[PDB]
Design a protein around this ligand. Structure first.
Ligand code: B12
Ligand SMILES: [K+]
Lengths: 181, 132, 552
């Protein structure tokens, strides 16, 4: 079973308490399909959603077109999530759990070193995000760090961002994404 | 002469009026000196302003004088004005109202023109809040 | 067939892991003189630059307009810009021309001119020039204090050991945003334990950091970012006006701070306007000047992986350091981020600034193993300390650090480990068990640190920020805990905000909390026979490393 993405016009802010919005980059699962370490967007997107449901909440996928900055991406997710808790993810893998009312460049959780994320982590990311939506205080996902990731991937990360940033649409509204298995 | 500390610090005052020589460990313990005291007076900033321009570093002296006009403004109001200057947070009328507050309520003459200039620039370069 | 073993061995070489790439100007992937960089030029009408580097005021962007009206001496530009780029490069290296003379000229040129001047120099010339344009006469150093677990016990400890090693500036940051207050706190407590007078920062989100400072939890801020293109500035969530107001905000509170920029930021964020990294960085350093900010942190910094990937990228890093200096700004010259798997390669990158010396050779030397470096690793970390000392002794070059005995450090790490422990008691924060103070004293990194209840900590942090805790509250907790000493030291740090002396260019503090900046310690290099020269005392310290055997 392969999880693919489906377009859906225009996503609207909601007030459905039991939801966590996950906003993906302009190119996520469309113009790009793998991360910096060649991990399919589908299996990731599958893990996030499964993490949310696992906690009882619903998870609605959307696509942020107005920006390629995961921070803003995640911030849009949150200020669109009836629970006020959203998640942003770039095609190269960078992910963040935001809250509608923190500042844009701040967050609840951050995964700044894409190449070190595993499907497991993407799953725990989904659980914690939902536990926040239920006004809980989940012990954050243990941060990981490798001093040679930048030397190995920084240049590459840049290129991926160049490709996904080409699909940014000035002022465009976020599009709803349907989950086809 | 510089540093101002060493040379006659009996006349170095916090904005509250307390002398630098009062900021003692005991007075902080005795509750006398408080958080609102450990700060810089516009007199002190005007001094460094001079020291800098005499070092040909006028640009920094201008900043210091710009900073002097902001000493009275509450900490939470500084954060608000800063956040409001950030991209897309404000409309032209809202920045211009802040310029009005700055000029007439705080007499921060140079900070008021600074904001009126940002207003104009955000207008030309489309950095004002989304739409309305 | 068969392959060469010679080539198999090389293929396995660490350096071959580094991400290198060919130049791609269209997307700003080139270190210098991109075919799209503008030609230097300027024009003034009635006291207003009406043309700047090929662009008429009509097409100025926020950055242009800001530099044109704040960063350039409008009166002398016309004439200054009449000098050939090469001619300025020559003065930069001329032992007969003085620092102040070139300053009068460079503060009157443009971003394109500055870059064009660098194009005329090899690294030796840039190093030569650098040792003269540096603001403060005595080179200093800044380190990083962090750990995978944002663990306060280990931060305080490390900060003490870093201070006794010599750093005058210490920087921390966090894996989990909400931990900042705690980290700033331990860094503050720890820093005064090792060497009183140590300045400290906590690099986080702009508005959050300004607040931490306002609460007396930090003594300075450096990562107040600035960028070379509008598009990037926006994604950075700032504008030259908001960032300039922020700068005055810090000063208005008596807080020292500097901007941060660096080659490669714009390209990595996707909007280079198909300009070269150095040109864009050039604009950044002029924004820094124009804003009135006294210092600048540059030299690729966090994006060293970018500028390092392309040709002449390291020479570029040095060049951006020099442009900042010749522009008369304090310069914390990076050397703080990982970029290579090779010791050979990373050493040459640092030597560029170590040998000549800058206000802060490293603006982020990791005072802890890199696996603990929350800035994704530094160019040099704690496991390099013995080497760095031997280099200074090898070349008679003060690197800004001294050797230390295991005993001195164990003791200093214990005092700070206990000091912070006491602070947590008095403030009613999640207890710091003795086993923790124990671990942190003989520990290398967070691998020797027993876990903590994050949830508990974060929760407490929130509580503390509600209670409105201040540095003064920390002073007290220390007095009532027996550490009158550290308490008075923290108090003296806060006092700095009253005199405003440590706001001057390149300002730092000594053991007596006395300022030492480009004002009362002017650099005056004019060729052999002048400028800085390690003092007899300092040389003896550098040479006398533990373990050096007496020949007899
Ligand atoms: C390189 C770097 C930068 C660069 C590149 C940014 C970019 N958007 O491309 C620059 C200097 C421009 C930058 C800026 C900022 N950064 Co930074 N950055 C890093 C660093 C040293 C390495 C990351 C890396 O190279 N990963 C490897 C590659 C291959 O993985 P990647 O997933 O593709 O990495 C991406 C993310 O890390 C992302 N990113 C970088 N910074 C930030 C900050 C936030 C809040 C978010 C959501 C994402 C993000 O940029 C990389 C793009 O390639 C990390 C340290 C760390 N522990 O990871 C700090 C770090 C992530 N940055 C941090 C901060 C706070 C910021 C700023 C908000 C600071 C400010 N004064 O405004 C800004 C603006 C953020 C923005 N709009 O992106 C903090 C985050 C703390 C937290 N919230 O938990 C860190 C941990 C420490 C620090 N202060 O230096 N940063
Ligand atoms: K730094």
């Amino acid at each position: 079973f392969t999880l693919k993405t489906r377009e859906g016009g225009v996503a609207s802010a909601d007030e459905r308490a039991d939801e966590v919005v996950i906003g993906v980059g302009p190119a996520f699962d469309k113009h790009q399909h793998h991360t910096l370490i060649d991990m399919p967007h589908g299996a990731i997107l599958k893990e996030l959603i499964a993490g949310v449901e696992e906690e009882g909440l619903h998870a609605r996928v959307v696509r942020i077109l107005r920006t390629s900055d995961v921070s803003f991406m995640a911030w849009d997710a949150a200020n669109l999530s009836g629970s006020g808790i959203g998640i942003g993810i770039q095609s190269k893998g960078t992910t963040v759990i935001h809250q509608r009312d923190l500042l844009p460049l701040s967050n609840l959780e951050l995964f700044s070193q894409a190449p070190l994320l595993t499907l497991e982590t993407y799953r725990q990311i989904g659980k914690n995000a939902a536990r926040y939506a239920r006004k809980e205080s989940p012990s954050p996902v243990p941060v990981v760090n490798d001093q040679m990731v930048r030397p190995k991937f920084m240049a590459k990360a840049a290129l991926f961002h160049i490709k996904e940033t080409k699909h940014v649409v000035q002022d465009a509204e976020p599009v709803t994404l349907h989950i086809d298995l | 002469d510089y540093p101002l500390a060493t040379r006659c610090p009996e006349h170095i005052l916090t904005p509250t009026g307390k002398p630098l020589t009062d900021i003692t460990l005991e007075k902080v313990l005795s509750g006398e000196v408080g958080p609102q005291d450990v700060r810089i007076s516009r007199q002190t900033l005007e001094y460094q302003a001079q020291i800098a321009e005499q070092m040909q570093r006028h640009a920094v002296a201008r900043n210091f004088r710009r900073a002097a006009e902001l000493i009275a403004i509450p900490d939470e109001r500084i954060l608000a004005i800063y956040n409001a200057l950030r991209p897309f947070r404000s409309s032209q009328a809202e920045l211009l109202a802040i310029a009005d507050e700055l000029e007439h309520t705080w007499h921060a003459t140079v900070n008021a023109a600074f904001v009126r200039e940002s207003a104009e620039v955000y207008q030309q370069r489309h950095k004002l809040r989304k739409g309305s | 067939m068969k392959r060469s073993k010679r080539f198999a061995v090389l293929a396995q070489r660490p350096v071959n892991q580094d991400g290198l790439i060919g130049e791609w100007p269209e997307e700003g992937l080139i270190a210098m003189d991109s075919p799209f960089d503008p030609v230097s030029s300027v024009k003034v009408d009635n006291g207003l630059i009406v043309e700047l580097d090929g662009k008429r005021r009509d097409q100025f962007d926020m950055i242009d307009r800001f530099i044109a009206d704040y960063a350039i001496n409008v009166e002398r530009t016309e004439q200054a810009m009449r000098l050939e780029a090469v001619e300025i490069a020559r003065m930069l290296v001329d032992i007969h021309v003085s620092r102040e003379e070139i300053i009068a000229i460079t503060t009157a040129i443009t971003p394109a001119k500055a870059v064009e001047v660098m194009a005329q120099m090899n690294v030796v010339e840039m190093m030569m020039a650098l040792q003269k344009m540096r603001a403060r006469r005595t080179p200093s150093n800044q380190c990083h204090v962090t750990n995978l677990k944002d663990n306060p016990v280990q931060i305080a400890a490390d900060a003490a050991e870093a201070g006794i090693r010599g750093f005058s500036e210490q920087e921390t940051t966090v894996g989990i945003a909400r931990y900042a207050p705690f980290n700033a706190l331990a860094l503050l407590v720890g820093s005064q334990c090792g060497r009183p007078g140590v300045l400290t920062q906590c690099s986080v989100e702009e508005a959050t950091e300004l607040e931490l400072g306002m609460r007396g939890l930090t003594s300075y801020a450096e990562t107040v970012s600035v960028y070379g293109t509008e598009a990037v500035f926006t994604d950075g969530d700032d504008t030259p006006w908001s960032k300039a107001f922020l700068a005055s905000a810090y000063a208005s509170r008596g807080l020292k701070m500097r901007y941060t920029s660096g080659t490669g930021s714009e390209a990595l964020m996707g909007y280079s306007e198909s300009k070269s990294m150095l040109y864009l960085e050039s604009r950044c350093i002029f924004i820094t000047k124009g804003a009135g900010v006294q210092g600048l942190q540059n030299g690729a910094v966090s994006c060293i992986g970018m500028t390092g990937a392309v040709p002449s990228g390291i020479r570029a890093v040095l060049a951006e350091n020099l442009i900042a200096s010749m522009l008369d700004l304090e310069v914390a010259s990076a050397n703080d981020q990982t970029f290579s798997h090779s010791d050979i390669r990373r050493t040459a990158r640092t030597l560029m600034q170590m040998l000549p010396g800058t206000d802060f050779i490293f603006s982020g030397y990791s005072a802890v193993p890199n696996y603990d470096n929350m800035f994704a690793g530094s160019n040099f970390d704690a496991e390099d300390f013995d080497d760095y000392n031997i280099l200074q002794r090898d070349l008679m070059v003060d690197g800004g650090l001294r050797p230390v005995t295991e005993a001195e450090t164990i003791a200093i790490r214990q005092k700070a480990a206990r000091a912070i422990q006491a602070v947590f008691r008095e403030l009613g924060l999640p207890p710091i068990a003795d086993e923790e103070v124990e671990a942190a004293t003989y520990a290398h990194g967070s691998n020797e640190m027993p876990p903590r209840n994050v949830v508990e900590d974060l929760s407490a942090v929130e509580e503390m920020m509600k209670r409105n805790i201040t540095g003064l509250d920390i002073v007290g907790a220390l007095s009532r805990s027996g550490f009158e000493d550290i308490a008075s030291n923290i108090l003296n740090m806060l006092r700095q905000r009253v005199t405003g002396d440590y706001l001057q260019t390149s300002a730092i503090l000594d053991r007596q909390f006395e300022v030492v900046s480009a004002v009362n310690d002017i650099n005056d290099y004019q060729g052999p026979g002048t400028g800085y020269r390690i003092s007899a005392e300092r040389w003896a310290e550098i040479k006398n490393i533990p373990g050096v055997v007496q020949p007899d």
